[PDB]
Amino acid sequence: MVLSPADKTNVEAAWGKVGAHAGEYGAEALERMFLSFPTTKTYFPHFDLSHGSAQVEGHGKKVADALTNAVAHVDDMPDALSALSDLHAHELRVDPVNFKLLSHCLLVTLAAHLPAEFTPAVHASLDKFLASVSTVLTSKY
Amino acid sequence: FTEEDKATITSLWGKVNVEDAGGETLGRLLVVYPWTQRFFDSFGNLSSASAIMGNPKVKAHGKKVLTSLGDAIKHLDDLKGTFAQLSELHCDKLHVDPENFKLLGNVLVTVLAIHFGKEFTPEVQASWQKMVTGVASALSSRY
Ligand code: HEM
Ligand code: HEM
């Protein structure tokens, strides 16, 4: 989605409040996705996907760190995310539905931990932001 | 639905404030997915997030939507039959594209996460995703 100036500032403030918990929330979002949408597990056949798995916690930190980088580059996400799109679109060929599933589970995780920060307006801006990340990661450009 | 799913859905719903969650769910639908405002023009001014969330008609309708979902929890093995008439209404009279039923369900799940916090565990969410998937499929059935 195309982000407004208000969307960008909303995302920066919300993700800033995530702060040091970013890695923790990324792993929780992954666990939520694997349990609610078990077809997503077929992309991780080499992972231990049980609860508390070291691989899932390490991967949640990677995803969260990538989102933090995307927030810093919210005005030039295609360039900033080119290597990541190369992995997800060219190598892994992730079906775009899966980005909607992870994005939903990220929002649920933020709602469960930061209810006061997760206002309707911020919810709307984060949804647009994650859809824009998802579009880049599913494009070959 | 597993028996575990049915117990989790029934248990959690008994703790939901339906009026609060209903208004918050419909309001968030309209804020987050703004084209859905077109279906509710009779509700008045939906031109900003705070105008939507404080609109008394949005809150009243949201209560009716969640009350319909709460009534369906007594019929979890026959959601198709329970929602057949409402499926016709949303298709033939309201012309709601069925993708929007999935969106409403996902907003409801986020609102439950807001309300229940850590208690809305990954396992509890998975039962509720089955719920909103089944509701959306039942409302789409007559399309
Ligand atoms: C917001 C969306 C996403 C972000 C920011 C993201 C981020 C990342 C990052 C940073 C990596 C590691 C890249 C590297 O080490 O070079 C990665 C790898 C990977 N991603 Fe994603 N990802 C997203 C969505 C998804 C989805 C939806 C799936 C599939 C359901 C997926 C499947 C994978 C897999 C299988 C790997 C390789 C993991 C491994 O072998 O260790 N990603 N992702
Ligand atoms: C879980 C999904 C949904 C449920 C359970 C649900 C349920 C209901 C119910 C119970 C009514 C009242 C019908 C009556 O008065 O006889 C209604 C009406 C209506 N619904 Fe839905 N609905 C859902 C999704 C949606 C969505 C996604 C939209 C549009 C984006 C929508 C648009 C409408 C409209 C416009 C009305 C008429 C409101 C009025 O002017 O009074 N519904 N729905």
Residue numbers in the entry:
A (entry chain B): 1 to 141
B (entry chain G): 3 to 145
Q: What did the original publication write about this model?
A:
In humans, hemoglobin (Hb) is the oxygen-carrying protein responsible for transporting oxygen from the lungs to all tissues in the body. Human hemoglobins are made up of four subunits, forming a heterotetramer of two α-type globins (α, ζ) and two β-type globins (β, γ, δ, ε). An alternative human protein is the fetal human hemoglobin (HbF), which carries the same α-subunits as HbA, but the α-subunits are paired with two γ-subunits instead of β-subunits. In this study, we characterized the structural, biophysical, and biological properties of an HbF mutant carrying four additional negative charges on each α-chain (rHbFα4).
The HbF mutant harbors substitutions of three positive lysine residues on the surface of the α-subunit into negatively charged glutamic acid, combined with an asparagine residue substituted for aspartate. The 3D structure of the rHbFα4 mutant was solved with X-ray crystallography at 1.6 Å resolution. The overall structure of the mutant HbF crystal was found to be very similar to the wt rHbF and the mutations did not appear to cause any apparent structural perturbations. The structure confirms that the mutation sites are located as expected from the initial design idea, and the negatively charged side-chains are positioned on the protein surface as intended. A closer inspection of the electron densities of each of the residues in the α-subunit revealed that two residues in close proximities to the mutation sites differed between the wt rHbF and the mutant rHbFα4. The charged side-chains of αD75 (EF4) and αH89 (F10) had altered directions in the HbFα4 crystal structure compared to wt HbF. These residues are not in direct contact with heme nor any redox-active residues. The difference in charge distribution coming from the mutation sites α78 and α90 may have had an impact on the charged residues of αD75 in the EF corner and αH89 at the end of helix F, as the side-chains of these residues appeared to be able to align differently in the rHbFα4 crystal structure. The oxygen binding study showed that the mutations in the rHbFα4 mutant did not affect the oxygen affinity or the cooperativity of the wt HbF protein.
